[PDB]
Each structure stands twice: as C-alpha cells, then as structure tokens.
DNA sequence: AATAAGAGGAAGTGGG
DNA sequence: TCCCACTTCCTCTTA
C-alpha cells in the first residue's frame, strides 16, 4: 500500500484535490493545505488505506509529523505548511 | 471562551 | 520475533 507522502505527492502532481492542497514554491518542495476543505483530503488518505475509523486531519498531521527525524516531510514555519525532501522529489 | 493549528507519548494494527 | 508504517487515543501547548 502506498506511503503517505506520495498519496500527497501525487495528489499535487495530478490537482485532483486544487482545493485541498497547493504547492507554494514547488521548486523547493513546499506545499500547503487548506484551512477549509483539508478534511476532504484527510478522508480519501483514510479510504485509500482501508483505515477502521474515518480519517481526520489531525491523525493525518500526526502521521506526517513522524516524517520529521527521516526528512521525507518537514513542517515549515507557515500556516499548514509542509515540505518534501529532494529525495522525495526526484523519486 | 471559541476556534484552530501544532505537538508527542504510548498503545494498537498491518503486513511483512 | 520484531520491525514497518502508520493509526488511534489522550493530554497538552500556542496563537
Ligand atoms: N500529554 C502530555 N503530558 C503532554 C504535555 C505537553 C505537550 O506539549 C505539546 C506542545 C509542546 C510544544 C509546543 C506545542 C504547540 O506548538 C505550537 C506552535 C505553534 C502553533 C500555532 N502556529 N498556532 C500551535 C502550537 N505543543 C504535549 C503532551
């Protein structure tokens, strides 16, 4: 099953979800999430896994956060911002 | 306060 | 056995 980061890495790349999530310089690898609609996103994470319980943004976000030691993901010092590592992004 | 973003320890679940 | 890669729960901090 796919890893969280490219669930969001491909949603980025194909804008299935413009409204949920955004690169901000996308050269650099940063992205941001919606204030608003990010739950809709956090939804399809959870159906995508098969999770038992529906998906929030928050245990999403607490996902992402473990990201933080490896490098894949780093939170960014902006409103519900994040970004991927250069390996991330080549691969 | 109400609302939202952000945090992480720890325990539980998947699939090797 | 025992790590993967989260998921879930709970309690808390910051703005
Ligand atoms: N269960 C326990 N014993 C426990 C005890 C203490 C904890 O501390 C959590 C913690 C530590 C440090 C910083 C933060 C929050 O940081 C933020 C930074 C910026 C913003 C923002 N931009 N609005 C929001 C939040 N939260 C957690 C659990």
Redesign the pocket.
């Known amino acids: ?1 796919i ?3 490219q669930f969001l890495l491909d949603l980025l790349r194909s804008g299935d979800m413009k409204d949920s999530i955004w690169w901000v310089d996308k050269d650099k690898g940063t992205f941001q999430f919606s ?1 608003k609609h990010k739950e809709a996103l956090a939804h399809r ?2 159906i995508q ?1 098969g ?3 529906k ?1 929030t943004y ?6 992402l ?2 990201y ?1 030691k490896t490098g894949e993901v780093k ?1 960014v010092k ?4 994040y970004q991927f590592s250069g390996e991330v992004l080549g691969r």
Request: charged share 40%.
């Open positions: 099953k890893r969280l980061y204030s994470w959870g896994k999770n038992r319980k998906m928050q245990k999403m976000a607490r996902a956060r473990n933080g939170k902006k409103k519900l911002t």
